[PDB]
Design a protein around this ligand. Structure first.
Ligand code: ZN
Ligand code: ZN
Ligand code: ZN
Ligand code: ZN
Ligand code: ZN
Ligand code: ZN
Ligand code: ZN
Ligand code: ZN
Lengths: 124, 124
């Protein structure tokens, strides 16, 4: 099932997926999934993971992956505006590569699909 | 009075000061002092400022500078490990320019003074 937000085939239970043409800073990479952070969540111990990744992690485990300190989801908090701004401006390559060559900021890919991507218009 | 940590002339009531040879991302700049963040503090509304800057700001004002939402210091929290890692690796130029040309990561300047700076050894 092709996602209308990121243009990749993934389930409703999985993260959005992106292809980054310029390398992403290792400090913006989620330690659970090894992709650039999406919907970042902070732990009380100061670590940061994708919301979906930490949520799924804590169903079958009960510690922070980075320091093994006990951890529960309800004391985690969405990351700051600053962190979201740094992630939103990461460059991504449109996944409809047979129709489109567009590189743009990650926060703008959905809009690109809705307005001016020949791939999204075609679909497959 | 020359600071042993940053090598600049400033009082105990003022921030550390640095010269950045490569431009710093605007999203890492403190909106109060307009320098790259030092000892970053997050507000409940998700904004980030230097600890010293927000502390001094809130003595004579009682709102978040970015959104004018009422704000008190005691509900602010130190920024995440991620944010600190991004700031620590910013490049700075040794301030003892008549003795030394060293560029290094901001978190390593103090150590440079203590071990291998001809400026710091000389002082003035
Ligand atoms: Zn998606
Ligand atoms: Zn993740
Ligand atoms: Zn942790
Ligand atoms: Zn496209
Ligand atoms: Zn100083
Ligand atoms: Zn400041
Ligand atoms: Zn605010
Ligand atoms: Zn030096």
């Amino acid at each position: 099932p092709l996602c209308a937000v990121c243009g990749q085939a993934h389930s409703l239970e999985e993260n959005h997926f992106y292809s980054y043409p310029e390398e992403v800073d290792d400090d913006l990479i989620c330690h659970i999934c090894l992709q650039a952070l999406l919907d970042p969540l902070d732990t009380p111990c100061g670590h940061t993971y994708c919301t979906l990744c930490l949520t799924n992690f804590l169903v079958e485990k009960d510690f922070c992956p980075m320091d093994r300190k006990p951890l529960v989801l309800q004391h985690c908090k969405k990351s700051s505006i600053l962190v979201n701004k740094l992630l939103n401006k990461l460059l991504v390559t449109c996944p409809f590569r047979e129709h489109c060559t567009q590189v743009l900021q990650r926060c703008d890919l959905e809009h690109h699909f809705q307005t001016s991507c020949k791939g999204a218009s075609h679909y497959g």
